[PDB]
């Protein structure tokens, strides 16, 4: 009787389809893994390269049938170190790392809307440690902790993590996603703490797909900058008054202004 | 009985994928198989960096079962390979 109970309640559970049980005994199936992987299978190029943590390396190549960079079987640890450094830096260094590997998409599992334990924020510290193992001069573990010495997502978190790429990648446009149940506007059901950076914007990425319960998020690595721009506003001195002009334009009156125009 | 007759954990997907290759290309193609769709800039020599015991058994049972005109898909063989072998484990 014990063996039958243990097999029924404990070890017979798939990790592909998640089952959330209603109160009346009805079971709902969160099927977001296969949804995102099937999109990735039928809405990308045939030779697209996805970047993911090593855990799902197999599952993408089996389900989604796309070229992964780092697999589940680990036989080259500096490749995983490169992927970890890309997943735990700001957008500029991570974008250089992603350009030198010819990556196209970036896949991150975010389990914050529903109460899913293992997402990539819960597996972020191992990324930091693996990337520290091979690049001690660039990534410091202690840098992603608060000056008290703990790992948190609030306003008290470190500004070295609040601009990381995993953080900016798995929390994009989440500071406006408020559940119908009365709770703060931004709230993480796993890390029961209100996010500190409500508004984040990308510079080299763009959102490509986001599953129904926001479980799996796929971003697209854009092309390089079309042209370089000045870092500063053009030169303005105080010798002559600027006298900036006012817009003077409606949806009906579309007529511009010229200083040196002969009047009638 | 619940959900669906599909594969579950992270590891069995690679076993499945290489077994599918062994079904659609034979044995001497799986022994020389140079997967370029994994570890992208490097490529993974699958035939020479894997243990071909699960794949060969699944492919052999698939071939025997399809020679007798019992048309079973190879994902069903990969799903139901383990209980059948549990019986043999009891005998052993």
């Amino acid at each position: 009787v014990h063996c039958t109970w243990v097999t029924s309640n404990a070890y017979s559970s798939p990790s592909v389809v998640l089952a959330s049980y209603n109160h009346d005994g009805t079971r709902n199936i969160l099927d977001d893994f296969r949804e995102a992987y099937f999109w990735l299978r039928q809405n990308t190029d045939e030779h697209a390269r996805v970047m993911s943590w090593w855990d799902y390396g197999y599952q993408i190549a089996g389900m989604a049938n796309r070229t992964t960079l780092v697999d589940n079987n680990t036989w080259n640890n500096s490749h995983i170190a490169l992927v970890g450094k890309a997943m735990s830096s700001n957008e500029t260094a991570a974008y250089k790392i992603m350009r030198t590997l010819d990556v196209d998409y970036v896949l991150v599992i975010f389990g914050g809307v529903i109460g899913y334990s293992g997402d990539d924020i819960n597996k972020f510290l191992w990324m930091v440690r693996i990337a520290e193992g091979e690049h001690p001069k660039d990534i410091r573990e202690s840098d992603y902790f608060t000056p008290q010495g703990e790992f948190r997502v609030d306003k008290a978190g470190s500004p070295t993590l609040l601009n990381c790429l995993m953080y900016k990648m798995s929390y994009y446009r989440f500071g406006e996603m408020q559940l119908d149940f009365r709770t703060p506007p931004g709230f993480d059901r796993t890390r029961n703490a209100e996010i500190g950076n409500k508004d984040i914007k990308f510079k080299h990425l763009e959102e490509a797909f986001t599953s129904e319960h926001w479980l799996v998020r796929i971003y697209k690595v854009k092309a390089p900058d079309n042209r370089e721009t000045l870092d500063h506003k053009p030169r303005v001195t105080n010798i002559f008054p600027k006298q900036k002009y006012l817009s003077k334009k409606t949806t009906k009156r579309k007529r511009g202004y010229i200083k040196n125009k002969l009047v009638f | 009985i619940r959900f669906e007759s599909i594969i579950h954990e992270f590891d069995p997907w690679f076993n499945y994928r290489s077994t599918h290759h062994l079904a659609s290309h034979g044995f001497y193609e799986f022994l020389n198989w140079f997967d370029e769709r994994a570890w992208y800039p490097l490529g993974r020599i699958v035939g020479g960096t894997v243990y071909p015991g699960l794949m060969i058994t699944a492919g052999l049972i698939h071939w025997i079962l399809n020679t007798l005109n019992i048309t079973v898909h190879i994902r069903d063989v990969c799903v139901f390979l383990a209980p059948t072998f549990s019986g043999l484990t009891s005998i052993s």
Binding site: S15, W53, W54, D55, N72, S117, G118, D119, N122, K123, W126 | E9, F10, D11
Partner: peptide, 7 residues
């Protein structure tokens, strides 16, 4: 008990 990172 799988081949994932310990969360």
């Amino acid at each position: 008990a799988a081949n994932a990172t310990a969360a």
